[PDB]
């Protein structure tokens, strides 16, 4: 298939992997830090999603160095995914407008 759609689907798959891996690693990094709340997996998965989408309610946040590094990877995976999809959409619309005008 076309490259922009392959890249978008790839990025969605990788994003799902980053969300799951980041949830696991966030708990691993944050347990052992007194006061940390990112310490059970279901709510860590929720936190990783609202971090990837850049919503960040602030109901949960990492306090350790490694938990925050994981957060940064999650943010960047989410923003990159969303950028990839926007660009793929733009590419589709541009090509269909080229055809509709007769190139």
């Amino acid at each position, epitope marked *: 298939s076309a490259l922009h759609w392959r890249a978008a689907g790839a990025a969605t798959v990788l994003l799902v992997i980053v969300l799951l891996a980041g949830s*696991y690693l966030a708990v691993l990094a*944050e347990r052992g830090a*007194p006061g940390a709340q990112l310490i059970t997996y279901p709510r860590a998965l929720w936190w990783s999603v609202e971090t990837a989408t850049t919503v960040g309610y602030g109901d949960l946040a990492p306090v350790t160095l490694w938990g925050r590094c994981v957060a940064v990877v999650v943010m960047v995976a989410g923003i990159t995914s969303a950028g990839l999809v926007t660009a793929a959409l733009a590419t589709w619309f541009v090509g269909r407008e080229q055809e509709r005008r007769g190139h």
Partner: antibody
Framework: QVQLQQPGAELVKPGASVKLSCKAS????????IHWVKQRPGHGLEWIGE????????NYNEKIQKKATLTADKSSSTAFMQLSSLTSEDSAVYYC???????????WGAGTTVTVSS | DILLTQSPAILSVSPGERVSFSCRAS??????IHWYQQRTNGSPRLLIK???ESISGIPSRFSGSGSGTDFTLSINSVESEDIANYYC?????????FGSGTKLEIKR
């Protein structure tokens, strides 16, 4: 099928050390944590520490003097707690417990009664 | 660290009455409180998770309520086998902590 198997008793000379075991069966996940809880006779439950066998990382109760070292053998599904240089204040039942990463102790071992005496 | 206060330490009831155990957290912890029963020479047994959620195999006369800082374990119509110590435990912040326990005693 007992999910967590612990020896009934350990006798330890004052100053000596002992390795408690906790053999796990049943469903095992990468999100499992094994916890260790100390109970002095007639007293409450004191959290000692935890280990995630899928990764080998262990954390310890900071409020108490560190007498424990937690390890886990993934091939024999066994968690260990090495207690070192014990005194009579270390005489207690020590439980292991399995937490599926969601915060509560779904199942407990039967406890190992450790007596520190000569 | 989250301090969990269980008071009173001893509860005295009559057979078949409703009993309520109190557990108070030193700061707000949502519903992240779990309740265990420990009989004489027995190991603890989970009764209620996340403040109010049932556990399979636990009699239905056990229930829990509350959120924030104030939690209650309830027994509808207590009977002899409920004689035990009862502990709450929080999982909202590291480290997990336990309350100091309430003993149930029955006046027969």
């Amino acid at each position: 099928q007992v999910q967590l198997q612990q020896p009934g008793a350990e006798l330890v000379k004052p100053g000596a050390s002992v390795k408690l075991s906790c053999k796990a069966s049943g469903y095992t996940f990468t999100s499992d944590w094994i916890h260790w809880v100390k109970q002095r006779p007639g007293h409450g439950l004191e959290w000692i520490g935890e280990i995630i066998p899928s990764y080998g990382r262990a954390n310890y109760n900071e409020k108490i003097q560190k007498k424990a070292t937690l390890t886990a053998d993934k091939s024999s599904s066994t968690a260990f707690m090495q207690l070192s240089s014990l005194t009579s204040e270390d005489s207690a039942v020590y439980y292991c417990a399995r937490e599926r990463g969601d915060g509560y102790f779904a199942v407990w071992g039967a406890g190992t009664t450790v007596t520190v005496s000569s | 660290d989250i301090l969990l206060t269980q008071s009173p330490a001893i509860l005295s009831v009559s057979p078949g009455e409703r009993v309520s155990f109190s557990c108070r957290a030193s700061q707000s912890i949502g519903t992240d409180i779990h309740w265990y029963q420990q009989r004489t020479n027995g190991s603890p047994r989970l009764l209620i998770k996340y403040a109010s959620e049932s556990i399979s195999g636990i009699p239905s006369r056990f229930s829990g309520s509350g959120s924030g800082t104030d939690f209650t374990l309830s027994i509808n119509s207590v009977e002899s086998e409920d004689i035990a110590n009862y502990y709450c435990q929080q999982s909202n912040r590291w480290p997990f902590t336990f309350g100091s326990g309430t003993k149930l005693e029955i006046k027969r």
